[PDB]
Paper text:
[name] and RsmH were recently identified S-Adenosylmethionine ([name])-dependent MTases responsible for the 2′-O-methylation and N4-methylation of [name] (m4Cm1402) in bacterial 16S [name], respectively. The position [name] can make direct contacts with the phosphate backbone of the P-site codon, and the modification by [name] and RsmH plays an important role in P-site function, especially in start codon selection. [name] is the only 2′-O-MTase among known MTases modifying bacterial 16S [name], and its catalytic mechanism remains unclear. The structure of [name] monomer is composed of two independent domains: the N-terminal domain (NTD) and the C-terminal domain (CTD).
Our previous study showed the full-length [name] was not amenable to crystallization, and the truncation Gly12-Pro258 was expressed, purified and co-crystallized with the [name] substrate in this study. The complex structure was solved by molecular replacement in space group C2 at a 2.20 Å resolution, and the details of data collection and structure refinement are given in Table 1. The asymmetric unit contains three [name] molecules; two of them form a dimer formed by a noncrystallographic two-fold axis, while the third one also participates in a dimer, formed by the crystallographic two-fold axis. The crystal structure of [name] further reveals a compact homodimer by making extensive contacts between two subunits. The two subunits interact with each other by a “back to back” mode and are nearly perpendicular with each other, and in this case the [name] is exposed to solvent for catalysis. [name] is bound into the cleft between NTD and CTD in the present complex, and the electron density for the whole [name] molecule was clear, therefore with well-defined conformation and orientation. [name] is bound tightly in a canonical conformation in the pocket which mainly consists of three loops: β1-α1 and β4-α4 from NTD domain, and β8-β9 from CTD domain, as well as sheet β7, forming a deep groove with dominantly negative charges. The direct contacts (within 3.8 Å) with [name] are mediated by Ile21, Thr95, Ile98 and Asp100 from NTD, and Ala124, Tyr169, Glu170, Leu198 and Met228 from CTD, with twelve H-bonds that stabilize the position and orientation of [name]. According to our crystal structure, we predicted the mutant D100K would abolish its side chain-mediating H-bond with [name] and significantly alter the surface change of [name]-binding pocket (from negative to positive). It was confirmed by the ITC result of D100K mutation with a complete loss of binding affinity.
Author numbering:
A (entry chain B): 11 to 66, 72 to 237
B (entry chain A): 11 to 66, 70 to 241
Write the structure that this text describes.
Amino acid sequence: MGQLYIVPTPIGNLADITQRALEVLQAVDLIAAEDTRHTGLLLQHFGINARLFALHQKAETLLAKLQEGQNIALVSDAGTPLINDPGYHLVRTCREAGIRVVPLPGPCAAITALSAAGLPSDRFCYEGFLPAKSKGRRDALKAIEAEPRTLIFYESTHRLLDSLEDIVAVLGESRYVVLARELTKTWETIHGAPVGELLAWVKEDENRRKGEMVLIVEGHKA
Amino acid sequence: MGQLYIVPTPIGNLADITQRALEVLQAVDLIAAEDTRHTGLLLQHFGINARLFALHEQQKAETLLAKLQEGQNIALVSDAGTPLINDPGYHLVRTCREAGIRVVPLPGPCAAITALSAAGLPSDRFCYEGFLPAKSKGRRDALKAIEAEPRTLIFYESTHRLLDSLEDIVAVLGESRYVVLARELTKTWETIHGAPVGELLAWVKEDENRRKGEMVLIVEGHKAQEED
Ligand SMILES: C[S@@+](CC[C@H](N)C(=O)[O-])C[C@H]1O[C@@H](n2cnc3c(N)ncnc32)[C@H](O)[C@@H]1O
Ligand SMILES: C[S@@+](CC[C@H](N)C(=O)[O-])C[C@H]1O[C@@H](n2cnc3c(N)ncnc32)[C@H](O)[C@@H]1O
């Protein structure tokens, strides 16, 4: 009976790899990836030759191979699979079929940003992406506006300015927010301020919203 | 001016440390640790000879801030997993941030996330709740405050309180709420078992081994019910 390995990958820095990750990737019969080409680049950097299987169900196909006794590693493009990344259907399928699922610890952008924010982390909520539509986004924000826990959002560069102005609008312009940009890359920048002043600070320079970002929002006073 | 590095460490398997963590732990002037003896043992496995600083005080945060300002680089670690995630360091990071000191987080092991990735529950959104109160009365109140939460919930629980805690979860959340018990992740006794919580509680009681070691609880969020 085969096993499924969940294997987190770097989020922009290739030294953020672990030895057990490299050993699992090289040992499994098959690697199910989000994008076979991103992962191929990654594998070639570490001198690992492996069979890739694209993850565009397909769960049932991979399930059969596991029952045939094949070991499978699930990876995503960056970070930890199933955290706003594919694989939720496969793990469900495998688990009720009695397939052992083995998670490797590794990089996760949300936790990485939270560890550097200087905000209360005894409790937090992970919200993923805000809605793209301005109305739907203001409604998600009103929905959590009272939440006392630290909130973590993933946000896109094109939508940051609009998201931030809505946040000012709904949560108020003195709500402390930490913007974590391009974690573990050369450009890495983490800056926190009252969200009013943060929005002002971001607009001063266009580059301050370039690349991948996480927002850490302080929770309501309570 | 020096920088403050936030450095995750293994949660039971030495091959889970990142290569960059090893690089940083060997390059900084000082390692500030939750427990210098526990950290000493980890460093020893990797041949690393380092200067350790005990965090056991905004007083000590002021000490470290001073070193950073005179140009010293500092790494912060906890006994396991990611610092600040139910581990000290929060005030130090804050103090450094408001003084212009750059904080550099390294990604790495975190038990909550590791468990979540393999639990088979919705992770589109989730709540990290940490440790439930140790006393049953306190614990039941904390559970009542989140009974209606629709997001997947994550809890840390101790081996000595798991059976009591599971009894209170049955009682407050109901015996059918799906819960996953992730035990001894990355260790040789690793076991991830999910079930309606009343069944989970019974399953655990069959064999005392099933509650030994370190554990995460992944709890299915609340679904709407007519009985209300
Ligand atoms: C679809 S998600 C993948 C999340 C990933 N699986 C993880 O482990 O967090 C991609 C989003 O994560 C966040 N992210 C990923 N890498 C990042 C980095 N290096 N710095 C800041 N945010 C990052 C960004 O918000 C980006 O839009
Ligand atoms: C105070 S916390 C430290 C959390 C750590 N900072 C992290 O990022 O995961 C310790 C608790 O985390 C959970 N934990 C740590 N290691 C674990 C493992 N290998 N398997 C299951 N749970 C673990 C247990 O509930 C343990 O009592």
